[PDB]
Ligand binder design. Structure first.
Ligand SMILES: *[C@@](C)(CO)[C@](*)(O)[C@H](Cc1ccccc1)NC(=O)[C@H](Cc1ccc(OC)cc1)NC(=O)[C@@H](C)NC(=O)C1=CC2=CCC=CC2=C1C
Ligand SMILES: [Mg+2]
Ligand SMILES: [Mg+2]
Ligand SMILES: [Mg+2]
Ligand SMILES: [Mg+2]
Ligand SMILES: [Mg+2]
Lengths: 211, 233, 204, 196, 195, 226, 222, 196, 195
């Protein structure tokens, strides 16, 4: 896998690939690596698929219970912390999970990285998975706070494409999300095969590849 | 986790038109030492079931006691213990299969391979296998250990599929089993000449044969074999 | 670590009616990293075609070696080598390194210039010949190629039909293998004309 | 494997079972473990079949060449050639050989060559995996200067017990009699020796 | 050693190589030149196990220089790269293989074309528009895939190279102490003294 | 692999299945495991497939030269001795397990040989992953003084047992009969009990289905005149 | 040392139609190079119009299916005989698998049936409990042989329309139950040829609004 | 160790050597391996001395408590208590025990309990490292319903050979006779049994 | 994490801690604050295994804050350091020990003295004028041994600290992405925003 997420002027972008592998065999061409915890909360998935699904769906239970008890949406900071504390219970037991908790709350847009070790980091931009290095390359050179929603969605899309191309264990399709103060907005499933040829022609990139 | 110490080799079995046949030799091996020569590895449960066991003998004796206790427990507050509510082969097998899988799940297995042969209330033949891993399967022929490699091929020439069962008589089936036991004696280094055989028929009931021997053996051709290549004398 | 799957790649060959086809992907990688999308794995010595999968250094090395040997064969014999003869040469050359082998999966394809009979063959890394009538597969997606070839293949296909069958077998096998893809090439071979086609495929 | 060689009044007798195993599978149930390196010098082989065959073939070569130059070799000389091979290649071999032969001068002689490559001249010898079970029986029942018929019964009874307890041993009991009269091969089937 | 980069533009080949040399937990040198001139229009950068790298590079250099004197003629970059590959492919099955990865940047005076060859320690050769060894490609190839054109000038090639180094300096945990950059073109080999 | 060898009245017969595997995958559905050492000496091999071939060709080559040198027809004991000494030298690293059979001026012979260099003699033998299934049949039905026709039947029945009951064996049955005073008859695909059934559908594609970028003619001819 | 796991071979295949679903699997059961049974059922009707197959280690496969069948029974008891929907069954199975995260059920599980809108549904699982809804999925020994063929012949991957040359894709037209069964039979016939653990027999369970139907076909026994 | 128990007409006799080794050092050359768990129920111990002593002590406790409540226990009952301990603790034990006892109803009985914890009722039993060397001898020379004097000679000759070939066995031969008459201890020194 | 430094001058304690956080081969963050305020006049920096560090620091923070509320009184830096040591010494013999090394910088308002305590994951406590954990001391202690006086001002302490960081940046192979510096004195805790 490759996942990314970044904050900007108009909220936070979330982009992931959809490939799943069992060794060198591609077990799945299209797997959902985002989880919708609530209308204002998202969660990315990298590592063991089972661990990612179980614990983040269990987080949504606990985030939902928070709303019922307090009559108010949980913060991104609190949600990420609950998850990191779950990881800390099964400390050294062999869980493999790398996720970004993305959302909008009272403090504005929020983005936290959380992994199996219990690490919990706040930041503007993150990328996880085997192809994160390729994604960071495009993100770091093109990112601004002053990005438009249209350009930002493209950046996250183009960054995954870069990784899907080079990384053998990343590909399939791109799932886009945009988080606003009115909630998250799904911006579709984009096949990499078709997207690659399109970007090549329109952008002029990937000159070394023949098509 | 353990290792098997005193062991029993192949148990072989097959279905025929009116019932099932099961057989196993009377040896208890201690590694390469043929230590114990009077070991019964076919254990009847009532008059409708025979459980054949291979592998660790100490675990076999444990299982033997569980089955003996199962019969006792089934008779408690049961006026139909010798009739409608008697123990069935399927009940006995599923009990053992439950025990075997639980024990492997605690990483403390019963180091055995078991075949439960019998006839049900409705006359249907029952033949199912279970082992130390809790793995279960059924087939017209079943065999454990070396029997799986050498006996099944011979027994499957008689009953290759389900439709061959009604065409197979008890005489033919017994003949095939007895021939298979001879082949195992030729080729299995951990086998013995003495064996036990059991037939469970839906009409004639349970026939248990002890102190059987492998006979009609071919050895004469050995006299002509000389050296390992070039030697003539 | 496994030399036969560091660089990745696949090769497949098929027989048709008075023709043969051989195809390969263009990927070369360092495990997860894709390095080249122009690494062709099929070579030809006269009218005999050889596809090689596995460790890239050995692929390159063996090409240069069989070029060496076939050029000498031709100077002495005063004729081009035939597929049946070349197949034995490959087997001989691989087995001479029995206890220090080239980590490869070669595939021979060609038409005997005298009899006109289509010919394909495959080898393990140590020289064992697989002379199949229908098809030969090799590479990191060999399991995938076996499934495709076994279901899609039918005997006595015409060149332009054989092209479609072999191309679809390769493409769809490569799309279920992380270490294969990044382009593809198909050779359609007839007794006295050979066409080479680069396929369009997903670049991930 | 169960092998033995026994000296008696008129010469020497070699005896062996016929079972060859690969784990618990019996690869050959009618093996001939009594092998000839010279007219009246035979050996019983135990250990790696590859190693013991390769050795016995080389020894046969040496004794054939010895005979061409120097005449009929002694049993001691044959045992020395075995030893030299077993001792100098001990790191790469797993061979336990019993050598037995007949001269008119020295009569019946038995030499045993265990794993290390040492040589031991004996009145009788036992070896193989099944030998362990008959150390007590053979020690109690062996006598010097037995008759041919007594010696055959001794080997038959002994190997019968070795076969009975050792799973790696079995099949038929082969025997080779070495005397001035010549070379006699014997065979005894299960139905004969099992009922002893 | 660690990072070596290469890019082939319109009329030249540019090689960038790190300056750091580490021994134990201490950086012994921050100005090391990980390259050897094989011929007037052929440059080879290298990275791998300590000691082996320089020994291999100098051995190759000596062989190419010997060829140049013998024939009074400069071998093409393609010919040199093939010679180097064979030596590495010969080496990998030796008792103790040479653990060296190289980039060969050359200008072919016959064809009037720049050429960049990437060869790893196994003897795996590939001709590329841009290349790297080790982990360097994981960070930089996405930038190169995006920005690279074949008609780029030498100055544009240097600007794209700066962007690659900046990305490395940001996302690598490793301090490689900057890079020495060298340009190979029709006029020969020269070093960019300010980078 | 399943292989057998059976002696009879006036000769010997060997047989083999035709499946070769790469782990759980079937690489070749019609492999030829019956190799020729000399015209009337045939062997059949299990284990490492390249080793059984290479070792058979090498000894066969040296046997041919020996036959020419001595002006005599080659003997099975020569092939046996040359094979075992070669295999012993490589201490099992050459994974060749063979059944060697043939006829020569001495008579008919049947030997087995293992990778480490040990040989055996027998009237009936079996090697490979299906050896136990095959040996069960041989032990059940073999007898002294078999005829040619009974021996071929027994041999093929033994291979079938391996085909049906062993996953490492399958497809067809090859046979070679070596009778005294006759030419050896190689019966390739003597039995064919595993023909694939007709597929339910044809997967022949419409022409133009596959997307193409470039086309080009490949020059396989040499440099031309004029 | 005791190894609690084993491999019983076998291969399974689930395909979701427009208003139907199929779950197929071979009937061969094996250890190493031996055949245990030529007919050992692997695909089960679990009630509520749901079919299930746990392929891999048979002991864990039988245990999981047994526990899910039990979960269906108790779902009726606890929730007034309400029908367990395929999506609800899928989520339940995830929690059954993850209850053994640190001593996994060594099986690749597939269930099939109809969703609440009456459309065909297939869900696939990994040993530790990751799941997702799919149109097409092969599992087990010969999964890598079959899946590429289904990408090509079910989803028309790499197939374009003649004349356009790669510009226009082959349109994704729906498949009938008769068409799907043909693709299933050819998939297993091809898998049987090239995989030693696949053979003996093929059993297909077809699910429609009318119920669960069975079909059996012979496979090569070598 | 070399231990055995043999049934005969009037009851049963247990026999054993007296050597206890720590590697090649003889830690005790006059060990008493014949241990009493009840008046006329004795056992022979082989394996870990710590394990077999701990077991026999627990069994003695169980049979003392059994007797207080239910009267004199059977030999089968004693063997069952041994078994239950050896079987349920098989992962942490290395014990090979032979149980032997006398009833007036059941007379002389012998049970052997090898490593796994299985139970086998026999006419006679042998165990210990030295038992391997006398499987053949004991099988050939054992008869049912022997006299006391015949049975003593049988055990004496048998253990004599086990001691002769097994370095882990040696010292004196101790014997315990179990009959209706009572309990008789016997001892036989090297100078007696070595010359057999 | 990697580098944490500490120095006690005349009237304050200065703690410097690296900003880098690495996961795999990628630097995820270059602005991480490896410290927690335990009380108004007590600061603890930390370094060790991923996840364990923050969990331990926050657990200590919670306990000291609980004590402060209960007694309406601030514990002395010495008392806090002893509490922390005991928790680590308790931890080292646990089933899974917490692999965390800490520096505790505090100003004792009773004695009017700055205090610096160095505690490793074993529970090894030492009071020092300057301290470090891991390899940090190998590069920096020679400079501190030379330049350190007990009557230094806060400004002089910062200048000596800059020199230590410069030496680390030169001789470490590791890019730790600079340091966040915090000062602890009589007026409390403040961060030096430009360093
Ligand atoms: C990249 C593909 C890494 O190579 C991503 O990290 C991806 C993340 C992800 C995928 C799906 C859903 C959420 C997140 N990771 C994987 O796919 C993951 C890599 C992996 C594997 C094994 C471990 O240790 C246990 C850690 C990480 N792959 C998987 O989890 C594999 C095991 N999944 C399957 O093999 C699989 C088979 C399958 C069949 C049917 C339905 C689902 C199936 C899955 C997920
Ligand atoms: Mg791919
Ligand atoms: Mg990719
Ligand atoms: Mg025996
Ligand atoms: Mg390279
Ligand atoms: Mg098959």
């Amino acid at each position: 896998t490759t996942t990314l997420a970044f904050k900007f002027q108009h909220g936070v972008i979330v982009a992931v690939d959809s490939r799943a592998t069992a060794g060198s065999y591609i077990s799945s061409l299209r797997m959902n690596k985002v989880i919708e915890i609530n209308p204002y909360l998202l969660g990315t998935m990298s590592g063991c698929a089972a661990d990612c699904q179980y614990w983040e769906r269990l987080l949504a239970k606990e985030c939902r219970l928070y709303y019922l008890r307090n009559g108010e949406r949980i913060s991104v900071s609190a949600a990420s912390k609950l998850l990191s504390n779950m990881m800390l219970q099964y400390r050294g037991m062999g869980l493999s999970m790398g996720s970004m908790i993305c959302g909008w709350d009272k403090k504005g847009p929020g983005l936290y990285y959380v992994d199996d070790n219990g690490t919990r980091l706040s930041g503007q931009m993150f990328s996880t998975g085997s192809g994160n290095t390729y994604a960071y390359g495009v993100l770091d050179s093109n990112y601004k706070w002053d990005l438009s929603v249209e350009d930002a969605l493209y950046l996250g899309k183009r960054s995954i494409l870069a990784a899907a191309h080079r990384d053998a264990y990343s590909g399939g399709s791109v799932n886009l999300y945009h988080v606003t103060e009115d909630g998250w907005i799904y911006h579709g499933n984009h096949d990499v095969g078709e997207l690659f040829w399109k970007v090549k022609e329109e952008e002029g990139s990937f000159n070394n590849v023949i098509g | 986790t353990q290792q098997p110490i005193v062991t029993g080799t192949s148990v072989i079995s097959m279905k025929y038109d009116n019932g099932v046949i099961i057989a196993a030799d009377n040896l208890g091996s201690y590694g390469s030492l043929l230590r114990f020569n009077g070991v019964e590895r076919l254990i009847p449960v009532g008059d409708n079931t025979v459980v054949g066991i291979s592998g660790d003998i100490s675990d076999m004796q444990h299982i033997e006691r569980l089955l003996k206790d199962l019969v006792t427990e089934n008779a408690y507050d049961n006026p139909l213990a010798d009739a409608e509510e008697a123990l069935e082969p399927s009940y006995i097998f599923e009990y053992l299969a439950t025990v075997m899988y639980q024990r492997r799940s605690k990483m403390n297995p019963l180091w055995n391979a078991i075949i439960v042969a019998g006839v049900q209330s409705n006359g249907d033949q029952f033949l199912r296998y279970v082992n130390l891993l809790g793995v279960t399967y059924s087939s017209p022929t079943l065999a454990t250990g070396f029997g799986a490699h050498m006996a099944n091929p011979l027994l499957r020439k008689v009953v290759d599929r389900e439709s061959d069962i009604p065409k197979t008589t008890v005489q033919v089936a017994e003949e095939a089993i007895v021939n298979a036991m001879r082949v195992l004696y030729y080729r299995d280094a951990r086998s013995s000449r003495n064996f036990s055989l059991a037939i469970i028929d839906k009409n004639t009931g349970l026939t248990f044969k002890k102190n059987l021997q492998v006979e009609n053996m071919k050895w004469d051709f050995a006299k002509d074999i000389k050296g390992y290549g070039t030697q003539k004398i | 670590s496994d030399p036969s799957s560091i660089n990745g790649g696949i090769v497949v060959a098929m027989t048709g009616k008075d023709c043969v086809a051989i195809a390969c992907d263009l990927r070369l990688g360092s495990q997860s990293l894709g390095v080249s999308n122009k690494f062709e794995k099929i070579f030809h010595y006269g009218h005999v075609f050889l596809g090689i999968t596995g460790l890239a250094t050995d692929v390159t090395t063996l090409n240069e070696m069989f070029r060496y040997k076939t050029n000498l064969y031709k100077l002495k014999e005063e004729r081009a080598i035939e597929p049946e003869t070349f197949t034995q040469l490959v087997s001989s050359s691989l087995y001479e390194r029995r206890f220090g082998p080239y980590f490869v999966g070669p595939v021979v394809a060609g038409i005997n210039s005298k009899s006109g009979k289509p010919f394909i063959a495959g080898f393990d890394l140590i020289g064992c010949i697989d002379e199949a009538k229908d098809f030969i597969v090799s590479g990191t997606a060999s399991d995938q190629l076996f499934g495709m070839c076994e279901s899609l293949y039918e005997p006595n296909l015409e060149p332009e039909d054989l092209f479609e069958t072999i191309s679809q077998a390769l493409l769809n096998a490569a799309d279920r293998d992380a270490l294969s893809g990044w382009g593809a090439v198909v050779y359609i071979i007839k007794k006295d004309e050979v066409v080479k086609r680069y396929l369009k495929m997903r670049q991930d | 494997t169960s092998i033995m060689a026994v000296t008696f009044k008129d010469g020497v007798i070699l005896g062996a079972d016929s079972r060859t195993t690969t784990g618990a599978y019996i690869a050959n149930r009618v093996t001939d473990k009594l092998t000839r390196v010279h007219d009246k010098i035979w050996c019983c082989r135990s250990g790696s079949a590859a190693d013991t065959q390769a050795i016995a073939d080389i020894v046969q070569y040496h004794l054939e060449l010895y005979t061409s130059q120097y005449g009929t070799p002694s049993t001691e000389t044959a045992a020395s050639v075995f030893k030299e091979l077993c001792y100098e290649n001990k790191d790469n071999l797993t061979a336990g050989i019993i050598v037995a032969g007949y001269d008119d001068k020295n009569k019946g002689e038995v030499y045993t060559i265990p794993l290390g490559g040492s040589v031991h001249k004996l009145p009788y010898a036992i070896a193989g995996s099944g030998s362990t079970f008959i150390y007590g029986y053979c020690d109690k029942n062996f006598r010097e200067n037995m008759s041919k018929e007594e010696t055959v019964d001794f080997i038959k009874h002994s190997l019968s017990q070795a076969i009975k307890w050792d799973g790696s041993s079995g099949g038929v009991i082969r025997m080779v009699v070495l005397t001035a009269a010549g070379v006699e091969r014997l065979i005894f089937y299960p139905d004969e020796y099992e009922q002893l | 050693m660690d990072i070596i980069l290469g890019i082939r533009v319109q009329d030249s080949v540019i090689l960038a190589s790190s300056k750091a040399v580490t021994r134990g937990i201490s950086v012994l040198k921050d100005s090391d030149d990980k390259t050897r001139q094989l011929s007037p229009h052929t440059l080879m950068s290298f990275a791998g196990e300590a000691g082996d790298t320089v020994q291999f590079a100098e051995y190759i250099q000596a062989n190419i220089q010997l060829y140049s004197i013998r024939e009074d003629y400069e071998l093409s970059p393609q010919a040199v790269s093939s010679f180097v590959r064979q030596e590495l492919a010969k080496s990998i099955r030796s008792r103790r293989p040479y653990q060296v990865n190289v980039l060969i940047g050359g200008y072919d005076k016959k064809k009037n074309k720049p050429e960049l060859y990437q060869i790893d320690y196994l003897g795996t050769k590939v001709e590329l528009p841009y290349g790297a060894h080790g982990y360097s490609g994981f960070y930089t190839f996405s930038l190169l895939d995006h920005h690279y054109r074949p008609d780029m000038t030498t100055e544009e090639g240097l600007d794209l190279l700066k962007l690659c180094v900046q990305e490395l300096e940001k996302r690598m945990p490793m301090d490689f102490k900057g890079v020495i950059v060298k340009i190979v073109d029709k006029d020969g080999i020269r070093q960019v003294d300010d980078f | 692999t399943t292989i057998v060898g059976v002696k009879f009245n006036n000769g010997v017969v060997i047989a083999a299945d035709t499946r070769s595997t790469q782990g759980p995958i079937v690489a070749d559905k019609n492999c030829a495991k019956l190799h020729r050492i000399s015209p009337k000496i045939w062997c059949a091999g299990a284990g490492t497939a390249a080793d059984t071939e290479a070792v058979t060709q090498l000894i066969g080559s040296n046997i041919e030269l020996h036959s020419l040198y001595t002006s005599r027809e080659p003997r099975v004991v020569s092939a046996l001795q040359m094979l075992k000494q070669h295999l012993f030298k490589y201490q099992g690293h050459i994974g060749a397990y063979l059944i060697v059979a043939g006829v020569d001026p001495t008579g008919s012979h049947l030997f087995s040989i293992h990778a480490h260099g040990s040989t055996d003699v027998g009237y009936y033998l079996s090697l490979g992953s299906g050896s136990l299934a095959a040996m069960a049949v041989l032990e059940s039905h073999w007898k002294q003084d078999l005829t040619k026709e009974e021996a071929i039947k027994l041999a093929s029945d033994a291979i079938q047992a391996g085909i049906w009951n062993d996953l490492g064996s399958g497809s067809n049955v090859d046979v070679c009969v070596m009778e005294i005073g006759k030419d050896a008859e190689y019966l390739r695909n003597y039995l064919t009990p595993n023909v694939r059934e007709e597929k339910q559908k044809s997967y022949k594609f419409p022409r133009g289905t596959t997307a193409v970028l470039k086309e080009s003619i490949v020059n396989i001819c040499d440099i031309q005149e004029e | 040392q005791f190894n609690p796991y084993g491999d019983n071979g076998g291969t399974i295949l689930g395909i979701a139609g427009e208003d139907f679903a199929v779950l197929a699997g071979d009937t061969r059961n094996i250890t190493d190079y031996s055949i245990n049974s030529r007919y050992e059922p692997k695909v089960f009707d679990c009630g509520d119009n749901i079919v299930m197959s746990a392929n891999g280690f048979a002991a864990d496969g039988d245990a999981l299916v047994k526990r899910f069948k039990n979960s269906v029974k108790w779902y009726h008891f606890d929730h007034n005989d309400k029908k367990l929907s395929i999506n609800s069954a899928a989520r339940n199975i995830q929690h059954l698998l993850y209850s053994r995260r640190f001593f996994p059920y060594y099986v690749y599980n597939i269930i099939a049936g109809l969703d609440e809108d009456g459309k065909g549904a297939v869900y696939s699982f990994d040993p530790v409990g990751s799941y997702q809804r799919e149109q097409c999925r092969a599992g087990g020994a010969a999964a890598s042989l079959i899946m590429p063929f289904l990408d090509n012949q079910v989803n028309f991957k790499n197939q374009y329309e003649p004349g356009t040359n790669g510009k226009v894709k082959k349109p994704l037209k729906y498949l009938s139950v008769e068409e799907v069964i043909k693709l299933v039979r050819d998939s297993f016939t091809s898998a049987t040829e090239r995989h030693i653990q696949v053979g003996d027999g093929l059993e297909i369970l077809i699910v429609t609004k009318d119920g669960v139907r069975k079909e059996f076909y012979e496979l090569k026994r070598d």
